[PDB]
């Protein structure tokens, strides 16, 4: 599949038994989600963005299904205005920019 | 070209006669640059991001070269840890996501 950039590139994920919408974000090194409930131990981290830094929990080896592809990676859970899928997962599904 | 996402997708732009590097950012909407000086009248605006909000100058109809493709769009000038090309210009150069 190929997605143009005339509207936000939003896809559907499954993670932790929950379904969410999330933004394909080539401007993000990492994947950040709000209001997902993940099991197990995590570590605290802080991420920066435009306009500031936010405190998050880091979960490793979280299985995630992104547009019907199954991948596994680190998922940050914390206050984000929109769910974001970053490069750490986009590489897993083979996603590229083309022009 | 084709750009994989194993490293940040950074391109070289030319804008207002100056050269800059910028991150191709599919999670943006808008283009924001840090230290350029564009001629003419602007409008003040606030943009939102992950950690908060920033106050910027909106310039319209700014010519810009993005990997040799010549494009005209709105560019926002203000506080940002990295220059960012958003969907507004990326649609002009034909950029898409592929997987």
């Amino acid at each position: 599949p190929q997605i143009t950039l005339w509207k936000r590139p939003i896809v559907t994920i499954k993670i932790g038994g929950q379904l969410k919408e999330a933004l394909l974000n080539t401007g993000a090194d990492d994947t950040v989600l709000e209001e997902v409930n993940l099991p197990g131990r995590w570590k605290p981290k802080l991420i920066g963005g435009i306009g500031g830094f936010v405190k998050v929990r880091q979960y490793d080896q979280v299985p995630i299904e992104i547009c019907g592809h199954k991948v596994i990676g680190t998922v940050l859970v914390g206050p984000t205005p929109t769910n974001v899928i970053g490069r750490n997962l986009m590489t897993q599904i083979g996603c590229t920019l083309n022009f | 070209p084709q750009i994989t996402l194993w490293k940040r997708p950074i391109v070289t732009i030319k804008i207002g006669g100056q050269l800059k590097e910028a991150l191709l950012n599919t999670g943006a909407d808008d283009t924001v640059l840090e230290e350029v000086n564009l001629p003419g009248r602007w409008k003040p605006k606030l943009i939102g991001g992950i950690g908060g909000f920033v106050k910027v100058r909106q310039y319209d109809q700014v010519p810009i070269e993005i990997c040799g493709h010549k494009v005209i769009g709105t560019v926002l000038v203000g506080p940002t840890p990295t220059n960012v090309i958003g969907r507004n210009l990326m649609t002009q150069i034909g950029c898409t996501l592929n997987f």
């Binding site: 974000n25 090194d29 991420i47 970053g86 | 943009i47 939102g48 991001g49």
Partner: peptide, 6 residues
């Protein structure tokens, strides 16, 4: 509108 690094 606009989205992240550690």
């Amino acid at each position: 509108r606009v989205x992240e690094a550690l």
